[PDB]
Design a protein around this ligand. Structure first.
Ligand SMILES: CCCCCCCCCCCCCCCCCC(=O)O[C@@H](COC(=O)CCCCCCCCCCCCCCC)COP(=O)(O)OC[C@H](O)CO
Ligand SMILES: C[N+](C)(C)CCO
Ligand SMILES: [Cl-]
Ligand SMILES: [Cl-]
Lengths: 507, 501, 526
């Protein structure tokens, strides 16, 4: 029983873009990309504040008595071992994203420096990438994850973001004016979310083909996408996602290990203890970077970096949020939070220490893989400066390929599950539908922009993300009232008032 | 009822100082002002060390078991609602200058920069201000407000600073040396406290009239206002069925809210709005450095800046601890210390942060855009400069002027109320005569400090505020132990104490 | 009994480096000094990363329920009690070091400036010195301290160090590949660690007596230093016997606390008392920015600084942790895990600071004027240089050397107590025989390190030490697990977690029923 009151209203906006953005006008879509600067200008501070708010909030609810509450029936045990549960979070913290921004990210920060420091600054440069990729985003993923994993397993509700707002909203048939709306926002956000990954993931393949066959064609993008958006429909008949799920991790294993030993090992090893310290050291300092610091200048830097990421992450929380939820059944609220923060974070700490960590060492010996200044080639260029690095580049391409599909599967499945009343049992057909409709806008962005295709990709996803921002914000409140009414916290507060009164009349 | 064993030493010393500052004695009270440097130099270490400890202390106390413990007969019906604090918290604690400082400070620290940094640093300029007006000034209040409220609304003892030292001194044996000296210094500091509040309100008016009517305060101004506000306060204190403290404060929040909301919308809204995360994050970051900004840093330079700022800021604060602290109790009963510690922390922080961010932040926004409002550089002229720079300036200016008048009568009467309550053997309710009488006891000096001829006198008291409570610093430190080695003699700890151990 | 299986492979290489340094290829030992530039740069990261983790590690253990477990057969009324602790913390652990680096480190930093900062930074000058002599170092101790203390006094087994590794290598069956090898690497690390401190006395005295007499070189003149101070040392020797030590604990106080309260009241009392919160503050504000200092920061240019300071320290501390944990363990019986961790960290770290605040402070304040104490760049000269600049500079200068004479025996005595204890199957009783034995451990290298044609047998001192116990790092690493995977099996904690379960499920039975009675009842209103 598909939810059409939610499916089509979403497809109305997904098409609006592909139609009005490539077919007709085209130059007009770049008008809404001025509504970008509109949103960062005045809704900008929100992302910054509630950003760091999401990181405290979650730690404190995990630190609280809530943490003990078992996600599922009372004293329910997890379904997999700690090791297997963690062995699944690793696959959650890897994909196109890190492929793209792995090397270029910390390099840019070394190259140009971060608003508030000089250029050529390892400590800062590094601790900024962390800022983006460790605690902060995963704090979000936890908010949405816990909210879903709680309402479904504990309270006993449908697997829908709206079913997490029940404590605040009607109710009496949750999905009146809101609900449908809240879900319609989830859907849209997830599309543009994955869109970026597919998007910047695509043209990182095209730029990568300039390692085998030789330059930056245009019909090539449509090729790389369509070639893989077909393989996605192909491998949309089994799951599937689990086969390649490791096929990805092994390739990602090669790339890393390889560059660990061939590259400046001891440097890369120095970056671990080093880029965990500057992270902590600078955390608050970068927590407060807005468009006032540094002397009303960092406004631009935020738009291109810190505020992009924040939007992106949010527009992905509906996807990642279900994943971690679905997996974590059984875990305690705390075990699930501390788990969700530190686990993926370790990998995002090593990964940037390896790839973009050599890019810094290189730029210190003159080597410089800057390659004309485009990140989309930065990666391969990095490898080409290492022995047998040309085969590695080939691997990387086939890797971003396997990523394109697996990343699209999980996305479409989630977007499917919530496009039809939270049915865990995903309809094989509606899944592929959300993939093509997604890959679609993942292409509609890449094409409409030209030389700065990357730009519009990040501006729209920021736009469609902003609405949800508020959703997730509110998902705190629904999550606190949901917890304060939970048996185990209610029953405990009854035991200390009793463990107080029992000694109030014996004296 | 009127305790005349402490009224005397105070009424005489307070009269001794005013004389040694008037009648051609105006110069020898200035040389005595530079004797302040003595304390800032040798007790510098003292303030900047413990000022930060208190902040950790209440936290470490709210954190532990002592937190759950209400203050009273347990589950004792609270009383005053949420609006009780926010009002008096900023009505008695501050309000007067925190309108001049709401702009001149964040605007100064930007322009000239604080030690160990470079100028035009928005972050620092906000973190330093914030530092001077949050966790710190409210812990050296919480300590007091928590101690007293416990040694009365729990134990039952009488509301008087020495009574809270019972745990350290002895059962009633606090009558000797340590105990009488307390009440004197607590009265001196509260008499000067009001005196300084009356003085600031007067220097403000000068610039207020400059906004409305100017004219380089040609006499009449100090009297025709300080008296107007004294005679306006002496009326809102007499009428029993009036309670100006519970009203004017509420009105005060409404005026300040109005004013704030004005600039916040007409002015650089987003800037203010970007300054919220900007302020907090920065504050958290620059906390442990500016917490340890000793006069040894940097390279020995910050000596002056500290004394003129942070230090003076502390020595000044420590003074208003009796009054403000007592008030954090005279209007609270039944709500656990924990729901109180953060009550006077998380909450005052919020308002101050926001206030500065709005004003101070806007000032920086102006400073950057080239349309400054620093002009000539008088702290007392800047608030209005920023104001008149906005549509409906002169208008909002009038109410801004009124604001300085509001809370004033309260900050003075409520400052005198606590006096009347600490003068009559620590009685919650005090005679309507002793309270208002002390609220004007400073007026008798204010009119003599100007009869010297022309103008050049008040400057004394400004610096005398520091040393006016210099010793009262330690009165806090000990009060910190008298609150730890006292709660461990409470019901829950004494039962496990007198058990197997 | 004696372990002629761990001590045999012991002195065989203890001297295979001693006679190797003084004899054989004299300048071949200067190839190992360029061989640490293989660990310091290749393991420097691993020395930092885990060094910091060490400070979080215990701190949580301290706050953990583990922090209630008492150390030894439940009750065990506190053995020594207090004071003797903080006195034997340093006397044993630090002691002499607090001087031959404690009044010059805040000074060298105020001068040259640490990497990532300009010179003349009172702040970093204080912050970077503490990073080395406070929270970080002691935390390496409290681990081995607990691991060892809990291993012996609680469980009730041997005082041999490798014992604490039975929860990981199996109990009673961890003697072979791993086990004896640990004890071997243990005794060595304690010999060198001690030999270094003993040789320092001669070096600091030879170049320290300059404030009195002996302007000659520094070779045969020192024969009356090493050979005499050790001669007067063993006494001791004639009698022990079982405990103190001690006669040095209250000594160090009266003595140090004297010269300290001396400079604190004579010198710039305020400039010191000011730098009091300034020390702590800046320390906290820079803690994470210091633990992030690597040979990749700043801009891959601080390696030769770190290698001279930070890593230098960390490496050494692990190579000195055996003794200082073996000794820290005693006098701690009947003291809880918590009060032990908050004992080794808070107070020792809380005094080192006020030490650098008085000595490092005035030493700095003297430079802010022009009366520099810097004596041609020599650690010994600076110490006396700043006290002879105060009324009675030769009256306290006396104690500057004569007191350091006590620290000589404090280390040796206490240290020997440990190395002796670990070669006797791990018993506690005072073994006079082995005590004085290892007491030698320097007569073949210490006094010979100088007879090498006059002097210059450096740095064959610091070189051999930090490389000796380079695997020790990975030992104090896996010591965290053997500490926690052991603490957790303790009856008191084993019972704490079981009770949780009970309450847990019982509380479910109470609930699952109501929702089945307020349900049948709810279906009764129909
Ligand atoms: C600026 C730098 C200066 C120096 C910094 C020093 C170091 C920082 C100090 C950090 C303090 C952390 C304190 C940790 C205490 C542990 C909690 C505890 O003792 O719980 C007891 C028992 O309590 C309970 O079991 C129930 C309630 C536990 C409450 C835990 C709260 C969560 C803490 C998370 C906060 C931070 C998370 C990381 C992100 C910042 C003990 O049992 P256990 O430790 O054996 O339990 C182990 C646990 O189950 C793991 O398997
Ligand atoms: C879960 N994904 C890997 C798809 C996104 C996080 O990088
Ligand atoms: Cl549960
Ligand atoms: Cl400094």
């Amino acid at each position: 029983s598909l939810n059409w009151s939610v499916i089509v209203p979403a497809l109305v906006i997904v098409l609006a873009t592909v139609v009005w953005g490539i077919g007709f006008k085209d130059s007009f879509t770049n008008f809404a990309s001025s509504a970008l600067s509109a949103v960062v200008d005045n809704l900008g501070w929100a992302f910054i504040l509630f950003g760091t708010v999401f990181v405290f909030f979650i730690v404190v609810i995990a630190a609280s008595k809530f943490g003990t509450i078992r996600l599922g029936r009372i004293d329910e045990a997890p379904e997999f071992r700690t090791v297997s549960w963690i062995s699944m979070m690793f696959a959650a913290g890897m994909g196109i994203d890190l492929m793209f921004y792995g090397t270029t990210e910390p390099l840019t920060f070394y190259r140009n420096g971060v608003p508030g420091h000089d250029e050529h600054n390892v400590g800062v440069a590094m601790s900024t990438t962390m800022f983006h990729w460790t605690l902060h985003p995963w704090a979000i993923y936890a908010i949405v994850g816990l909210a879903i994993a709680y309402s479904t397993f504990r309270v006993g509700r449908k697997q829908l973001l709206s079913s997490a707002f029940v404590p605040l909203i009607g109710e009496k048939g949750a999905e009146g004016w809101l609900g449908k709306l809240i879900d319609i926002l989830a859907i849209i956000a997830t599309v543009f979310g994955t869109a970026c990954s597919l998007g910047l993931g695509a043209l990182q393949i095209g730029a990568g083909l300039s390692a085998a066959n030789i330059d930056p064609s245009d019909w090539t993008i449509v090729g790389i996408v369509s070639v893989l958006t077909l393989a996605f429909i192909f491998s949309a008949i089994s799951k599937g996602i689990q086969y390649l799920s490791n096929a990805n991790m092994v390739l990602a294993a090669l790339l890393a290990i390889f560059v660990f030993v061939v590259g400046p090992t001891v440097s890369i090893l120095n970056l671990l203890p080093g880029s965990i310290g500057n992270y902590l050291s600078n955390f608050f300092q970068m927590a407060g970077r807005t468009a006032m610091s540094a002397d009303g200048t960092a406004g631009e830097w935020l738009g291109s970096w810190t505020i992009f990421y924040w939007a992106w992450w949010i527009s992905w929380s509906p996807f990642v949020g279900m994943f971690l939820a679905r997996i974590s059944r059984g875990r305690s609220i705390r075990e699930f939070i501390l788990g969700v923060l530190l686990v993926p974070a370790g990998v995002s700490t090593v990964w940037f220490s390896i790839f973009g960590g050599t890019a810094i060492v290189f730029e210190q010996n003159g080597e410089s893989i800057w390659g004309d200044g485009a990140a989309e080639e930065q990666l391969f260029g990095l490898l080409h400066a290492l022995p047998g690095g040309q085969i590695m580049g080939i691997i990387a391409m086939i890797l971003l390929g396997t990523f394109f599909i697996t990343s699209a599967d999980s996305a479409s499945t989630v977007m499917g599950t919530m496009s039809q009343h939270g049915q865990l049992e995903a309809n094989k057909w509606v899944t592929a539908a959300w993939g093509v409709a997604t890959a679609a806008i993942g292409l509609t962005l890449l094409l409409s922009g030209g030389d700065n295709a990357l730009s519009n990709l990040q501006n729209v996803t920021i736009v469609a993300a902003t609405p949800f921002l508020f959703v997730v914000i509110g998902l705190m409140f629904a999550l606190v009232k949901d917890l304060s009414n939970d048996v185990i916290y209610l029953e405990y507060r009854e035991q200390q008032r009793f463990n107080a009164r029992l000694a109030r009349e014996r004296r």
